[PDB]
Amino acid sequence: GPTIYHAKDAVQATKPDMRKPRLVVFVVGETARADHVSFNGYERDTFPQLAKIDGVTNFSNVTSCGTSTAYSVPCMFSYLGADEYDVDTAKYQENVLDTLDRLGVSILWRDNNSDSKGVMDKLPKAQFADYKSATNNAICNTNPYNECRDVGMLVGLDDFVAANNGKDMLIMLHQMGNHGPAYFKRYDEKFAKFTPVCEGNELAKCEHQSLINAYDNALLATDDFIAQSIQWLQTHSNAYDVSMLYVSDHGESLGENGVYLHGMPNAFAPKEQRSVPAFFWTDKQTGITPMATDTVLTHDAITPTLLKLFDVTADKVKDRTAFIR
Ligand SMILES: [Zn+2]
């Protein structure tokens, strides 16, 4: 089909041959609720590793585009904004990855969730890698489900950096994260802090506290994955300006008014399905300044954030609020 462009005017103001190349990891999260984040007031410390890392910003007021992976993920990378976004014709629209690629940024998408929901479809197939099986993911045999773990996506990223030495790079890591209903399968035993847990798919038959426990354990694993992503970036901070962005695709209902899981239409969806966490980290030397933690933000902020991270300006999102200055 056709491509309708939105950033043909886009210009990268400076190039990696004149200033430090930039290296960004964007963790595309899954099913995480803002109100179960310690930083947002949650009673449990669900992000203990992130709490110890300097330079992390937590955003307390972020609303997802929609309530499902298929709806939210393409919107996260869209130029159109939630008001004009259409899930069925996103495939015909230039998205922010298309732009950054055109401007010379090396794009990599590793996926331990499903796939990019069409976002990577215009780009060469080799730039997308499936990390849901043991063919690519070296960390799948740590649990009785043989489920591949998000941290497996970090393995061998030095190879990608070496292959693209001196270039700007954007790496998407699409998490399995807190995907349900089987929250108990989403984390290895070392993250089983809150017990007992719900261990079946009939969620309404579990004790509510056990359901919450499994969900919170899954967040601990995500805290770990993000912390290790930051550590990996840190090892490249001499040669690259390094940053990490995390946003979840949507939240999750956990029994409130008897509603479970997600995917409800936006018109009727409860707040829990759209209130998501977002984190930003950057190294001391990058000169990137986060917006105020309580800025009213949505998934619409992702595209101008990614453009700003690579010194690109596009008229379409000129004045649009981002996660960063
Ligand atoms: Zn999802």
Numbering used by the authors: 217 to 541
Sentences from the paper on this structure:
MCR-1 confers resistance by modifying the colistin target, catalyzing transfer of phosphoethanolamine (PEA) onto the glucosamine saccharide of lipid A in the bacterial outer membrane. Here we present two crystal structures of the soluble, catalytic domain of MCR-1, revealing this to be a zinc metalloprotein containing three intramolecular disulphide bonds. The two structures are essentially identical (RMSD 0.37 Å over 311 Cα atoms) and reveal an overall α-β-α fold, containing three intramolecular disulphide bonds, typical of alkaline phosphatase or sulphatase enzymes, with the N-terminus indicating the likely position of the five transmembrane helices.
To facilitate such studies, we engineered MCR-1 to lack the five transmembrane helices, generating a construct containing residues 219–541 (MCR1ΔTM) which was purified and crystallised. Phases calculated from datasets collected at or near the zinc X-ray absorption edge ultimately yielded structures for two different crystal forms in the space groups P41212 (1.75 Å resolution) and P21 (1.55 Å resolution). However, the two crystal forms differ in zinc content, with the P21 structure containing one zinc ion (Zn1), coordinated by Asp465, His466, Glu246 and Thr285 in a tetrahedral geometry, while the P41212 structure contains density for an additional, also tetrahedral, zinc site (Zn2) coordinated by His395, His478, a water molecule (Wat1) and Glu300 from a symmetry related molecule. Furthermore, the active site of the P21 structure contains electron density corresponding to the presence of a phosphate group attached to Thr285, the conserved residue believed to act as the acceptor for the PEA group during the transfer reaction. Moreover, both comparisons with previous structures, and our observation of phosphorylation in one of our two structures, clearly identify Thr285 as the likely nucleophile and PEA acceptor in the catalytic mechanism.
